[PDB]
Amino acid sequence: NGIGIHEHASIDLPGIKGLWPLRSDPNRETYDTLVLSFVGQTRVLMLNGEEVEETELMGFVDDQQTFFCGNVAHQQLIQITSASVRLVSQEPKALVSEWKEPQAKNISVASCNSSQVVVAVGRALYYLQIHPQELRQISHTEMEHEVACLDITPLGLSPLCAIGLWTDISARILKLPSFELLHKEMLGGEIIPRSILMTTFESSHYLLCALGDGALFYFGLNIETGLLSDRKKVTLGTQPTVLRTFRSLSTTNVFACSDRPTVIYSSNHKLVFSNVNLKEVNYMCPLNSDGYPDSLALANNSTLTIGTIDEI
Template sequence: MPISYCVSAKKASVVAESVVGNFTGISGHENVNLIVARGNRIDVQLVSPEGLKNVCEIPIYGTIATIALVKGKRDERHSLVVVTDKMHMAILAYRDGKVVTRVAGSIADTTGRTTDSPCSLAIHRNGLIAIRASEGSVKMIQWESGTDLRHFNVRFDYPNVADFKFIDTGDDNVYRVAFIYDDDHGKHLQFSDLNMQDKEFRTYSRQASIAADSSWLIPVPHPISGVLVLSSNSVLYKSDSNTDGDGSIVPYSCSLLDNTVFACHSIVDASGERFVLADTEGRLLMLLLNIAESSGGHYSVKEIRIDYLGETSIADTINYIDNGVIFIGSRLGDSQLIKLETPSNGATYSVVLETYSNIGPIRDMVMVESDGQPQLVTCSGAEKDGTLRVIRNGIGIDELASVELAGIVGIFPIRLDANYDNYVVVSLADETHVLQITGEELEDVPLLKINTELPTMYAGTLFGPNHSGTLLQVTEKEILLMSSSGLDRSWKPSNGEPISKVAVNAAHGQVIIAARDTVYYLSCHVDEMGGLDIQLVAEKQFEDEIACLDVSNEGDDFTKPATFLVLALWRTFSMQVVQLPNLKSVSEPHFFGGF
């Protein structure tokens, strides 16, 4: 019978979830990570002034349901909580340059009906994890470094729960949750406290009959505390107080919110005064809280305001990173990295810094053939982000670093006392730059005795990896041979003419140069004591100027020195095969009609 073999040609590009925190390094602006969940893998990226840099990719054996960051009391960095759709959970950490599993296990219930809404995950300020995946209960997970997952269920008999969040009361021993549910009398907002001894919820306060389409809760950090309730036409702030005093309930509505369906949100300030919101039409909004402080040190919300920031891809997840930079993760279109700018008129708008291609979801596709190569034409994306895309199998290139230099005429990779190329020599029209490769950064640095005041015709190391400390540079004036030990030698053409062409057999130190109509064959050497030497083996004057030359190994055998070179002359339109080391011409084919 026929057998088919299937393999993924492209990894998933949709963004399901994303979080921002200090995963790969201790807390600080220089160690901020953007962590993106895509189907069955997680991409960890480092936020840098040059943009997002890939750190690692974490494969997950299952479909990711949700992710979150948690930080223990003794931890200097965040750990990553991953929950799959089969209710397997893992807590991952980044240690010594690799991802390690701190704890993992199944948290699935053997009884109970799965909730109609997506799995809800909430994390308390002291590390208690709450997961609502089954009707009638909430699973509480207690975990400390080096221990197994301890979890228990708490009865939760509320129908049609839309959202579920922990409230930041400022007290590590108060486990207060807020949730939206509806019954026969309408939709309600309720605060309940979890009693850890009895393992049950006790009602703290309740706001009955909120907007019928309320669907999102945004916890406001301490000392303001409370929650924001988002609906399609209004925003409601409810403090965590169980009294109806001044500032306990603050409603807000404006024309920007007419028939708005919110998709995601992210906090901007640690104080909780600003939030960015995204809706299902791709609009980006800023929600601002006007905070007042009483004489007793209590904070209250006096006013809510919402401003329009611009239009983005339809967001499924949004993360405020830092310095006005926001990540827009999309399932229906391309993901984006944007920056909030403030023009002279005081308004705020968004500018796209970078776009990350997403070919999903693919609604339809057809195979076509162009120039003998099959390719796919896909109907990708949806709604306003729908596109037609042409996809072919090939080689892709990722940009790791870039430096703006005008007038580049040559570029030479250098591997100096290293296993990989660690320098790049860049020749401009009138000078040379040496760029050091450090991770994913390029830095202009001096290197040995390289002449940076003239353009470089050739630069590279000689004699293979065993002598990677020997460097050759050829400029129009001279040949420079140098080593990492500090020694150097130079050589100049005897006819006083500038060097116009160069060919090098680096493995054996053979250097062929042309100075107008004269060809010089030189041999570079390194003795047992590390001494350097450039020897002139032969020179020959030809009847015309040299147009180009190349030194090659016979039969492409690079274990032996080259035995001939090929050169071409101007005006006569002729090519000569020249024998080494005596520079004797052994063949001279002509090309009628010119090159």
């Protein structure tokens, strides 16, 4: 059913390719920062309370394009870029650790939770853990095919990693401290996966994989062994759909960015695909700040917006 969006603010910003919520202060809770992405460029926004000041962040780099960045363990921040994953102390605020592909290859794909980072490189996977002032590398294997997307959302640490491959057009579940195969799913066609995600809804875990043509697949997921069951496919849009997890009055829903915004939730023990009443939403992230509580940041083609859902 229809979901409305309560616009709170609205700035004109063409070219956003990503946005991530950050906490500059270990002592505050609420997010006070908003990092934007552009072609080869990254910008940062300071959030006061309805006030947007444009800023700079010291460990972070601005001449690259950010694939991800957020609050990591041990009071630190992380900025995975096309060139390197760089760790940053929260206190003084400086690069305390930086990882790079042993041969100068561009990271091409990234995923990261608070303690783990799993990046790809055209067909290779690297697992890194987040220690005090160190990006410690734990293992590195080659995938039969170019990696198109991955996720490591914990369901502490995550014993599982979820990948989407190029040609094979498979969705797989791998063991982290080894990358051993736990389950492979052939998905059909010539459209590669563009977004993959592991999440939980009432009390059950699911695997979500959005293909480049707007097709969304959702499997039930068994953590313990990582086996997918009850494969269902629905269509949401015609353009690549990107899946992001956000919090509602409840604790967890899923925003689907595409030619047709869609929020995924759960009433009983079955999914529901509500339509968001907005032209189109290309990128989004949750945004819990004093300026705006549990809200959201939706980025269009030339607009950045913050607002809330009404309720369920």
